[PDB]
Amino acid sequence: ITGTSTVGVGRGVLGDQKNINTTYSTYYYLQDNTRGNGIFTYDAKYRTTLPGSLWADADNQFFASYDAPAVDAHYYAGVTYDYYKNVHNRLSYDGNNAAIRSSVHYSQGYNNAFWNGSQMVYGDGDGQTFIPLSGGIDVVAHELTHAVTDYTAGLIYQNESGAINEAISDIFGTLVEFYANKNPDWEIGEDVYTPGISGDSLRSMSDPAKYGDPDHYSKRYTGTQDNGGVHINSGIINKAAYLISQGGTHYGVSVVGIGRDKLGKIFYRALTQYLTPTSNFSQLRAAAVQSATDLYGSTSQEVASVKQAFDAVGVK
Template sequence: MKKGTSIALALSLTVGAVLPFSSTAHATNSQNVLAAKIKESGNEKNVTKKKGQAVPTFIHGKLSNKPHKDKEAVKQFLKDNKETYPFDVEKDLTLLDVTKDEIGSKHFDFVQSVQGIPVDGSALKVHTDEKGYVTAVNGDVFVEAGDYFKGKGKLKTNLSKKEAINNAWKSIDLTKDETLVDFEVGPKGEKQSGTNEEGKQVIYKKGDNFYNAYKVNLQFINPYPANWVVYVDAETGSVIDSYNAVTEGTGVGVLGDTKKLNTYYSSGTYYLYDTTKAMTGVIETRTAKNLSSLPGSYSVDPDDNFNATNQRADVDAHYYAGVVYDYYKNTFNRNSFDNKGATITSTVHYGRNYNNAFWNGSQMVYGDGDGTTFTSLSGSLDVVGHEITHAVTERTAGLEYQGQSGALNESISDTFAMFMDQKNFLIGEDVYTPKIAGDALRSLSNPTQYGQPENMSGYVNTTSDNGGVHTNSGIPNKAAYNTIQSIGYDAAQKIYYRALTVYLSPKSNFSAARAAMLASAADLYGTGSTQYNGVASAWTKVGVN
């Protein structure tokens, strides 16, 4: 990419052994219907089973002789193969979702239930190719669950969900009140807690037994980070099982560096899902799998070591989102971008060779780059900080994304990215033109190096890019650089944050930004102070009076 060309960082910048089909408690000779089809295709070994489970966990091959293009046809496929999948499809299986991928394959996701109560951890996935032929069936379903409760009549629930939650708290020797942490969340001093609790009824399998239970989640940060999963017997109220699902995993980032990650464990899988922050939501990372659908599927790993090449963008998006959260919380006591603990969602692997990153009004989105202009854009703290700051701006000043207010919006994101990184005054150098050392997307210290004006004398009047928001942002960027050089990072970030959250408004232009910065400096340090004079000089030097 030529130096003068701008890229828009828009609002943006356990599987068991492979076994042949053999007799089980539910097997008959006709069970070989699917097995025969697999053998015909030469894939007779593509049947995986877990010890103690009657239903195979994975079958792969040419599994149907005719297309099955919709949910009713797929249900009929399961009915036709009742010897392999011995369920009442209408009563025991509930279709949750149908998705279609980029190669035309469809994926039908079912969950198992007993008397209408979902079986915890169950899943049955039927996959068809672009023509509708079934090519795989996988997941964990338990015929044994239905057998276990057969003849016992309607399952009883002798305690309420609230009582189950109370029993769960007792089991971990804490009360909800002992975990509460208050945060200032508004101008009137409103308070809110960093603790969440929820419960739902499930059928839970432990060993060879099944239980009618409540699955209770207790999430808190104080006195220690926790996401307790507690199973409470719905009939007796006793605790069947429990574990703390907060884990610390590791991962390798875009640049090959190893990072520690806050992850979440469920049903043998680790998720990039961080519940350890003092917020009402979470930090979650998803993947679009090179499609353009959002938010995509969760980023997962079987051993909590996210070190595969295709996981590197996921690792950095997750890790850096946590860094940005911590920056705003520790520096300004801001609880997520909305100051109310909102979930921070990031989606990576968006599209193919997508050279951009953006905030879409509800989440961050990162492309993988084309390998020449960009590598994976989540691999840079300043890019991630830039995007999440767009969310902060949206919930505070609400700067309109056009003309000078739009350029100011972009500049605010660049400036706070500098406050977080403090490595240099470059934006995106870690991911921009990966084959060219020392290159960057923008520079706050020298905007002209990358085709931006650094003074009002060079202001670009244009109808493109919403009035040149990514071009003219060079002017307030240089003012931010001048401010930092004059009064230091600490004072500068306090002044900028106060201006953003107190004084700036949707249509603020550069002059209004100068005034907002001066008012903030006066509030914090006094009119005529070193900090006040430093701000005034910084904006005068770029021609904003």
Template structure:
């Protein structure tokens, strides 16, 4: 979309019954990621080894000639090939679910556990085609975890004590983050600060810890979705990061750019609400206003005559309208019902704080600032921004990409990529709301990442501890691969490949090599190994230096 200038502006494998398979003799060095052919996996199988791990993170190809059509046979397959992943199938792997997709493929989703406690990020997937032939196995498992602990695992801290430690580590209390919630048109209320605590086995460097994984989500005094790992034995904070997915991003009335829009509203007690209840089998799409305060969720965006025409209502209009457009895109293109695929309410708050040059998904809802009029105008005024933020929610509920380092950069890139899929016409991000007085400017470019300070090849990867390991910088590399894929295959083909990779293959700790393997697996599922589409994906990632 052309910007208008206005101040208003990631196994064993069998052929026949079982192939002889040997595990890797040594750990792959941390500074090397290897993708290679390996004859022991069968002809044409592709194997990706992740840095520092003793087991492959992704194996793809025709991995069996025998059909495996249920949980019992899949587990038997893994037992027969135990030496590669070095796991006890009965003790170490817990089946979470089995999903069948539109191609008839089945996806067996496991998590590694130790004494019944999940290993954080250790998702493990076995994929079969419609005939039961195993076509891919991927994920991150850590064999050393099973023998690391002596005796029974038992937490010495309660969840309440671990939560206290987590709050102390970010120098806030829950009370500091509470704001007043307002009843909506249906009389509902919800709390704006969320605490979650789960007991996990956490891997840090080469050690494993029994830990509580804490999530602290709040908006006051700043937008946050803290992930804090607290040692469940001694209370030490092992790691923490703020996983708020932020970035320059983006209602009947006029939007931020003065364009007229038809809105789905809700009438109650003489007042019209930006509260869309028309989506089938879904929750509502609602918009609230923080009224230039740092509060969540704020008051409902309302109007007396159902005409949201005031200039001050433009951000409200766009937030609600574009959220509906993003919902419709995911539903009509992929049959996905809201970000959780279960009809979750989509909630936005606009007019957050004063002169706030940002927007973010905080784990519960979207939040948009109005900008300062120089760097940004109201950020909800761009479809690709709204799509970016809502795609963070889709990623959270599917691949669950950790918001640090390469997985975090992938998280950002996926959001940028789907923003472009929705806002077709260019490969820019945020151009409608960024630097209103500077024509042709944007926040990021998929076609030319260096134009806005991002690398477009692994030779220029930025190693940094800031910005959660450079998630907003290094996203330029997968962004360029996405551009090359789109320009070669077209949007409709590319979006199918990317959605399947996101929802079927990617995992919390996937790196760039895992992303390449996931996209190739998705292309093979949809169009066949060695197809034009498959080769285009491979070429795109080759060009950005990712193997």
């Protein structure tokens, strides 16, 4: 909407206070004009019609319990935009500052979040399995990264390409979590998963097997559930990414870590210059090796470490 840029204040899902960019025209709307062509946050009102209504507030204060998921979706979309712009020189998900839209309060007791082809969508969770999912910065960045993937590599959402698609979202979700630097880790969704259980998460990149996911190609799932295991086989690639960044010895194969920043550069380049809609794991290895070669040289430690990591997870 047309109005003047303002700054509201509120509390997120975890009870933390933060400032948010809003727009004033009669009401204060969750519309951040400071980033690209805007970040817009909508109320789905417990229903499934999307996007719902652009979030409107009378006083620019967002401290109500109902406000919390909107505050976080809006704010973390901002952080994710900043990461892509500042770190990778990418302007929004399409590279041309496309408007970023999110809806919160989607459905009732909805234990998931997704990119629907056009926008991000967040359930509130059922209160036991999840609290409102926009409370997780890794979750928000995971979702926006699906949009980035769809506009770039276009990885088909099934089987190996789909598992790469998922891993890319977990990798950048995690790198954005580190970028924000609040309780960062290599786990996925820990901030919003199972409020009654401390120390768990949906997936682990450092040890995918902790939550039953494969950490070696020999353990890949080849059934039909979960689009051919896209959230399961992602563990194999997540493990490789973790090893590239942090190093370690995995099934006897030692990897020299090169750090998060280089992991991000290598995978961002692979995603945007080499991967295609049908890339499989072997092709990702080749794309990552080539990306590291472009950035650091064929004889570099970085290239050697990428090879070691894929060797460690059984991908040739």
